[PDB]
Structure formats: C-alpha cells, structure tokens
C-alpha cells in the first residue's frame, strides 16, 4: 500500500495568514491526489481532485499543486471557518490511502490557565472509586502540562487527560485532568496536589486539598 | 441537492457482524460508484471499499477482503456494507459517499455518518457524581461509567450555557466511558442561584438532573 505522510501533524496561524501543507507519497502517484477538509463532528468535505484542480464551490484561495511523490496544499487569506483537519489521499492504485492529517488552530495571544482543583464526592466515595479532577480553563497555547501529586508521589497511569476544541468565540483551550484511585488508596493518603505549567505562567501554579 | 442517509449506531460484541446502510437520493443510483470510508476515534481515514450499484460489481481494501460485504437494493435506493468477525479496532465512524462529476460542476456527497462500536461492554447509564466549587467560581458534573456513547450535557434545563465546557469522552479501562462537565460562574451567586447539570443516555433512558451545591 502507497503510504502518504504529511507534514506538519499540527500547525498554528493566524487569521488572514498563509499556509502550506505538504505530502509524500512512497511511489509515483502521478496527479491522482485528492484533499480533504473535515471538522470535527462533520464528514470530509472534497477540496482538490487531480492535484490542482478544486472541487465545484471551493474558493480560490485553497490551491493544491505537485506530481510525482510530492505534493502540497496551499491556504491563503485564512478564514476562522479555515481552521480544521487537511488530509491527502492518492487513488493512484488500491489501496486507497489517505495521510495522517494536518490539524490547523487559530494562532491567538497566549493566555494562562485557570486552575481549580475538585476532591471526590462522598456519595461517588460510597461506591469505592475516588475521582479527582484538575481544570484547566481558558488558556493558549494549547501545550500544557499536569502533575498529580498525593503525599508528593508523583501519579504515573492513573490519569486521563481531555481538552476541548478551540472555542469560536476566544480560540482557548480547557483541559481535565481525572485522577482516578481506589477508595482504599484514597483514605490512606492526605495531601492532593495538581501541578500546572504553561507559556502564561512564569513558575509553576499549584492547586491542592487535604481529604477532610 | 444529493443525500446520502445511513442507518443508526450500533453496538457489537467482539467477533459478530455488523450492517450498515446508505439511502440515496436525488441522481441516477445505478450510474455512481458508492464508497465507504470510516474513522476511529481520534484518528484518520481509511478507506474499506466502493460498489457500484448498477451492476453489484465491488472493490475491497486487501485489509478487509474476505471480512467485508458490499451488496445494493436498488428497488430502494440503497447500498450496504457489512463488517464481519469485528474486533475492538472496528469501532469507527463510518461514511458513505458518492461523486457527481459532469460537464459544469464536480461534487462529492457524504452521509451523516454511523457509529459501529465493537465492545463486550453492555448498556449502562451514568453515575453522575457534582464537582463542587471551592468572583468567579469553577463547579461540574462528573458522568461516570456509562456506555455506549453519547451522552448529552445541558446546565438549569439549557438556561446556563455561557461558560460551559463539556470535555469529549474518553473510554476508561473498564470497557466503559467517563467525561466530566464544567461552567465558571460568579462566586457571588454560590449560595443564592442553584446549578442544575442534565445529564441524558438514550442508550439506557437515563435521565438524571444533578444539583450542584457547594459542600
């Protein structure tokens, strides 16, 4: 199978910028190469057929260019509806294959996270599981890193980490952090600390309760 | 303009077969190719295969080939793709689509779109569990341990919706999935204005309406 790599996996502009995706095929695909735009939620939507030609309906500010084993898409005057999922594929030969996706976010200020911590309730306590939940909300970039301390031993692998879609209204992020312990393990211990690092914040913020 | 209209989610167990259909309407069913492509969670396209309705003549990726079944009924305008022997790497989204290429337009269509999740797990609602707060004050909802997806998230019956953040599930080990809800409010209105998260599982019937209060 033809494997298509693209490149970069995540790229950042701004508004009215221009930008370049790229694309190597492992063979000769010729000019059968198509692009595709997807938002999240939403089925693909056809960009480009025969490497430079675009799909009836889509501006002329998406060009696609390139034969052969490379190829790039171009995006110029950005537009926030822009910003979303790029993927090549080449119907050269079969398999069909498509690349491993370009994300493109909307470049803004940076701006630090705010961070509130949340204890396990007493009634999910009475079922055996303790959740402990770290937010982070309202920040960019989207890069952030979360420590979970408990007696200051920090957790490895029994955390998971979730974050939103940019918002459409001020393009931050928000991130959760769930700490997820056995009841047991959760009473033998007393200090729950997270630990916050981010390009808004000079030294690291941390935010903790004491299980009482 | 084109549709393509696929059949519901679905949940399989490892090893069973599932069937998805894709309805057409408005162009000549038997002159268009119909492709399948699907998307786990969190990943890529792949591409499974097309059949061209006219003549139920088919095309398969090697990597489903004797797993995959493409057929058509052209009486109702539908193509369908069955998935055999499927494993937890099945689950995906998966699309339908067609391509009307003539002399003054080219265009693609797509369908909505159909969930197939492939999991031992059985039907379980939510565990709702408030995130309580400590001038603007951070307070959420927890819903845990359910399955399949979705899950829908409303605050005081879709009153509060500026500064909401509901996160995207993820599927906790245990076979089932977890996501937390959260909205920053002032921290004046604590102990004068109730927080109500809605919290709702067709998959189960479960409706629960969670007061958020501050402990």
């Known amino acids: 199978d033809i494997q298509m790599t693209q490149s970069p996996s995540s790229l950042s502009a701004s508004v009215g910028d221009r930008v370049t995706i790229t694309c190597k095929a492992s063979q000769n695909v010729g000019t059968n190469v198509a692009w595709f735009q997807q938002k999240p939620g939403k089925a693909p939507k056809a960009l480009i057929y025969?490497?430079?030609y675009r799909y009836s309906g889509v501006p002329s500010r998406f060009s696609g260019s390139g034969s052969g084993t490379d190829f790039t898409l171009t995006i110029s005057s950005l537009q926030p509806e822009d910003f979303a999922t790029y993927y090549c594929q080449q119907y050269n030969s079969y398999p069909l294959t498509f690349g491993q996706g370009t994300k493109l976010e909307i470049k803004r200020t940076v701006a630090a996270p705010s961070v509130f911590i949340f204890p396990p309730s007493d009634e999910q306590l009475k079922s055996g599981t303790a959740s402990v939940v770290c937010l982070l909300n309202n920040f960019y970039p989207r890069e952030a890193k979360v420590q979970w301390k408990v007696d200051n031993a920090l957790q490895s692998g029994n955390s998971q980490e979730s974050v939103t879609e940019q918002d459409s209204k001020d393009s931050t992020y928000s991130l959760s952090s769930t700490l997820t312990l056995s009841k047991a393990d959760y009473e033998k211990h007393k200090v729950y600390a997270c630990e916050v690092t981010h390009q808004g914040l000079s030294s690291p913020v941390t935010k903790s309760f004491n299980r009482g | 303009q084109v549709q393509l209209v696929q059949s519901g989610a679905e949940v399989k167990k490892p090893g069973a077969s599932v069937k998805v259909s894709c309805k057409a309407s408005?162009?000549?069913?038997?002159?268009?190719?119909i492709n399948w492509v699907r998307q786990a969670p969190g990943q890529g396209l792949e591409w499974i295969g097309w059949?061209?309705?006219?003549?139920?003549?088919?095309k398969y990726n090697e990597k489903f080939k004797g797993r995959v079944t493409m057929t058509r009924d052209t009486s109702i305008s539908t193509a369908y793709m069955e998935l055999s022997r499927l494993r937890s790497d099945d689950t995906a989204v998966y699309y339908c689509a067609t391509e009307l290429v003539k002399d003054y337009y080219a265009m693609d269509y797509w369908g909505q779109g159909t969930l197939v999740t492939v999991s031992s797990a059985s039907t379980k609602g939510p565990s709702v569990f408030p995130l309580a707060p400590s001038g603007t004050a951070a307070l959420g909802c927890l819903v845990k341990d359910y399955f399949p997806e979705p899950v829908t998230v409303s605050w005081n019956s879709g009153a509060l919706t500026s500064g909401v953040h509901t996160f995207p599930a993820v599927l906790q080990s245990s076979g089932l999935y977890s996501l937390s809800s959260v909205v920053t409010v002032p921290s004046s209105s604590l102990g004068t204005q109730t927080y109500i998260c809605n919290v709702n599982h067709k998959p189960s019937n479960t409706k629960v309406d969670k007061r958020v209060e501050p402990k």
């Open positions: 408005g162009y000549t069913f038997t002159n268009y190719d």
């Open positions: 059949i061209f309705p006219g003549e139920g003549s088919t």
């Open positions: 025969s490497a430079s």
